[PDB]
Amino acid sequence: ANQASVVANQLIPINTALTLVAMRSEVVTPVGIPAEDIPRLVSMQVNRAVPLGTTLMPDMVKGYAA
């Protein structure tokens, strides 16, 4: 229901570290990474470019296990 996910607040380039300016929370479908894990995601790198407004999915973040 209102399970919110991490959404790209700006484009995140391939192989670049996640910052707090880059991740917002939003109720989207399909469900991606829980918004509650944003602190945890800071400094982890994405393995692909993530366009503005894309939901961060588990497979996009290098080293993410939940």
DSSP 6-48: EEESS-B-TT-B--GGGEEEE--SS--SBGGGHHHHTTPBBSS
Please answer whether residues 56 and 5 qualify as being in contact, where contact means their C-beta atoms are separated by less than 8 angstroms: yes
The yes or no reply on domain 1-66 and CATH 3.40.50.1820 is no
Are 5 and 55 contacting, i.e. CB atoms less than 8 angstroms apart?
Answer: yes
* Amino acid sitting at position 18: L
> 58: helix, coil or strand?
helix
Q: CA–CA separation, 11 vs 51, rounded Å?
A: 5
Which has the closest alpha carbon to 8: 44, 65, 57?
Answer: 57
Domain borders along the chain are: 1-66
* Cβ neighbours of residue 12 closer than 8 Å, sequence gap 6 or more: 18, 22, 46, 49, 50
- Tell me the structure's resolution in angstroms, rounded to a single decimal: 2.1
Q: Is 21 exposed, middle or buried (0-12, 13-18, 19+ CB in 10 A)?
A: exposed
